[PDB]
Structure 1
Amino acid sequence: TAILYPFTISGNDRNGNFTINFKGTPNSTNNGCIGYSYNGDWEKIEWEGSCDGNGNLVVEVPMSKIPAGVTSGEIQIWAHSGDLKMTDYKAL
């Protein structure tokens, strides 16, 4: 089953990286997306990654991938070999 976390951002500020911290099973395989509505339609930026030996995975997507005017959307986990939860996100 997919796991969805809503996010909210400034509509205008596009400095730096959309940075998501995940926590889960050491060395697990994982993938998903960041998704949002734009011009009426849902668009998706995919991520994939393994948790390190400490159980940490940091996904960084450039804020410039998300068009301006977008204020919200969802962090989605599509598959996870072990445990995985989003601890937080931040534009950085």
Structure 2
Amino acid sequence: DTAILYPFTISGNDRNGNFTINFKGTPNSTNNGCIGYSYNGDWEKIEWEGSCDGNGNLVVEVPMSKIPAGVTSGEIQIWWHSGDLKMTDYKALE
């Protein structure tokens, strides 16, 4: 079914560590999606995928260095979720 989009905001200048996204979902599910943002007038996507563990938790990490400096916002997208999946929270962490 339908893609789920979550607007995010980050530092435009701090590129230390990892964009860290926590999802809660059906235990043992498969899921995938992206982080999407505009840079230089163009839409760019960094894909993620992962399975929820036995507790229904999924942590996705994307290194910050993959996102150009000067980008401060975009969308976390869920594309495929075998069961249920929600994004509970995100931040840049080291």
Classify the TM-score, shorter chain: over 0.9
Q: After superposition, what is the alpha-carbon deviation per residue over 1:27-85, rounded to whole angstroms, capped at 9, x for unaligned?
A: 00100000000010000000010000000000000000000000100000001000000
Unaligned runs of 5+ in 2: none
Give the TM-score taking structure 2 as reference length: 0.97
Between the aligned partners of 2:61 and 2:49, the Cα distance in structure 1 is 11
Between the aligned partners of 2:11 and 2:58, the Cα distance in structure 1 is 24
Between the aligned partners of 1:10 and 1:90, the Cα distance in structure 2 is 10
Percent identity over the alignment is 99
- Where has structure 1 moved over 2 Å in runs of 4 or more? none
How far did 1:13 drift?
A: 0.5
Specify the SS of the correspondent of 1:64: helix
Unaligned runs of 5+ in 1: none
Between the aligned partners of 2:11 and 2:48, the Cα distance in structure 1 is 22
Kindly report the root-mean-square deviation, in angstroms, between the aligned alpha carbons of the 2 structures. 0.3
Give the TM-score taking structure 1 as reference length: 0.99
Please list, as runs of the form range in 1=range in 2, the aligned pairs for 1:1-92 lying within 5 A after superposition: 1-92=2-93
Between the aligned partners of 2:50 and 2:72, the Cα distance in structure 1 is 25
The number of aligned residues is 92
Between the aligned partners of 1:69 and 1:89, the Cα distance in structure 2 is 19
Between the aligned partners of 1:78 and 1:43, the Cα distance in structure 2 is 15
